[PDB]
Structure formats: structure tokens, C-alpha cells
Design a protein around this nucleic acid. Sequence first.
DNA 1: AAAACCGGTTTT
DNA 2: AAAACCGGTTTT
Lengths: 196, 202
Amino acid sequence: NNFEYTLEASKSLRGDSTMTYLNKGQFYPITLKEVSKVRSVIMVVFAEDKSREDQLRHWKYWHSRQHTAKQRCIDIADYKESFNTISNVEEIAYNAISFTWDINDEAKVFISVNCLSTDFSSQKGVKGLPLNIQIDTYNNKPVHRAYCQIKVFCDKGAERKIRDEERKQSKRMDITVFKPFIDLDTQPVLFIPDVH
Amino acid sequence: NNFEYTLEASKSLRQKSTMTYLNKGQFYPITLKEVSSKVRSVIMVVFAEDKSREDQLRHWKYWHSRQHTAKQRCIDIADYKESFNTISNVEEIAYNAISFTWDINDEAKVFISVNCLSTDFSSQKGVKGLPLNIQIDTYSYNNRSNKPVHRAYCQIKVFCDKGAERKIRDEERKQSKRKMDITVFKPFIDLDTQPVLFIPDV
DNA sequence: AAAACCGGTTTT
DNA sequence: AAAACCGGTTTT
């Protein structure tokens, strides 16, 4: 039971960990593949600290400053070409989306992150928290687990960050493969859980 | 009856609308003198672009709400002995207003710090800061009429840390390639209008 | 102390 | 769509 998840967006160059830059509200194509209908859950969580006290503290802070209470941390596009490969789509939480797909057919979804990396601090001129796109694939534990470290920028910030990086070194590659996670028996924190 | 107020700090050196840059919490020397009798002057900090009392209080209340200390004042005067020599009856009538009495025949010097940033009025990130005004109303004892015989202001912007000096460098290096340190207060004709006061006291 | 970093914003 | 502007922050 081995899997390979793929995110297609602008990727950084060279940093020793995986890094991917995304735009707030912009949809990105995620690929699901294994080497029997299985259920996978795509989530957005923090990377540096996985303590439930601190993560929810951030989420609660972010949600309070949001203009819409209905606004979700993560969204999936209601595109028919996505709904062809998957179904039984359920939003179990504001930062979690669950759906069922088949192994024999490669699954494609479109995901957008609606929170900025800087929306967790009131400070001005600061870097901002790194985020993780975690996909759990579930027979009450996942057989496979992977994550993808990202940073979300306002407007078209993701493309600008690439330019600045390219001019740093001054003085295929658009594909990001999810990094597998060994720990399976730990539960990820969920912000405002639904569908009990 | 003519007056002259003086602020010694970093001067804009730009459009030639004089503008002066200050650091939050840093004291600056203000000079008060009359040219060709104890008089009372009030030094205040108010907004420049919009003077509606509803909006000014809206800004101040926003700033005050984000402050770590409720006792924190918009404007402060240094308890310096060389300052208390030229003035007296120092009273802080408001969080953004300080009143004191001085004599004409002796030049008055005080030390003032602004404890609010120009960007502390918006939650937004990466935007310009609001312009502020240092307004000095001078109420005469025999003239009374609850109105200043003279009025002047000084348009300023307050920067974090040593930001005021940095803004000068960027400005100095800009006009270098392409395109006195003393700032004199600009007099104001309208005297019978009342300045906005945040949390009035006394 | 001056200069570079950071990213939302604004300009072009 | 690619760079400049802005100012708090960090680095040197």
C-alpha cells in the first residue's frame, strides 16, 4: 500500500525542506494515486508546532478577524472534471475535506487555501507561519499519510516570491510531490468540526 | 502679538508643505518665543487629513484599544529640570493634550514624545501611515474668550525605532541620483474652532 | 548605526 | 503581468 500525491504550482528552488508557494483563494490541482474504493482526507495544518492548543489558538484568532464566519480554511472546487474521479464529498471541518475515489482511476481535485500565512499574527513586517497540506488515506487509521509544506501569499504573491528568489542567486520543476509521514496513529487538529 | 514655535528634528527635504519625521517614545525639543506677563500654551497631537471629531475619536479609540497599557498617553512631556525652568503649572488636560504656563521675556523649551505610530490606526499591512499635526494653542490671560490669540501646527509622521532617520536616507538617496534641521511651525488663521481632545481631564 | 529582509499594497 | 513603494523587523 504505497501512494503518491502531487501538487501542481510554482515551487521554490533550493532551504532543505519542501516548500510550495500558493495564492489565497486560487485553486490548485492535487493528484491522488496508489501502487476497492478508498477514502482520503485533505487538510490544512501548521508545520512547526503540532500542539492542538497552539494551532486552535491561531485558527480562532484568524476566524475572528474574517469578514465571513462561513469562510472556510480550505475549499474544494465544484468542478465536474474533478467530480468525475471522486464522489461522496464531505466537509468534515473548516480545514478538512473528505471524499472517496477509486484506485484504478487517478483522482484529481482543485484546492484553495483561504488563509494567509500572515493572517495569524497582528504584527507588521514579519515572515509568517508555514502551513502543511496533509492528506490522510483510509477498513480507524490511515494506511498512508503525507504532507506538503506551503506558504500562502496575498494576490499574486507566490509568483513574486519566485522572482525575488531567482534574483537572489543572481549575485517537471512545476510539480510538487507530497512527502510521506511515518506517524499514523496521531490525530490531526480539526477547526470547527462538522458531519459528526 | 506674534508668536514662533520651533521643533528640532529630521526635516523632510522634499516637496518645494514641510513635513517632519519622529520616533515613537523619543523626546524632541520644542521652542516657544514671542518677538516684536505669564501666558498659557497647550501642545497637542491631532490628525491632519481629516479633522472631523467623530473620525478622530474613532482612530484614537482604536489605538487605545490595542495599547498594552490604558494609562499610556498619546503625548508626553519630559520631566527635565531644564524644561521645568522655563515653564510651570504643567497639567495634562488630555491624553493628547498638555497645558503649561511660561513667560514671554524668557524663551521656553520643552521636550515632547509622541507615543503613537502613524500606522497604529490601521490593522492593514504594507500601507502608508496617517499624517499627524502638532498643534499649539496659546490662551492669553487678559484676552480670554476661551480662544487662542495665536495658533500654529506642524505636520509629522511617527516611525518605529529609528525609522525617522531611515526615511531620510531613502529620501536623501532618491533625489541624489534622480530629480537646517530646524522646523518652524506654520501659523493657523482659524482660532475659534476647538481642537479634538482624547480622554479629557481636569 | 546603516542596510537588507518581508510581504501586502500600489503603481505602471 | 512585473517592479516599485511602504514601514516594521531583522540582520550586520
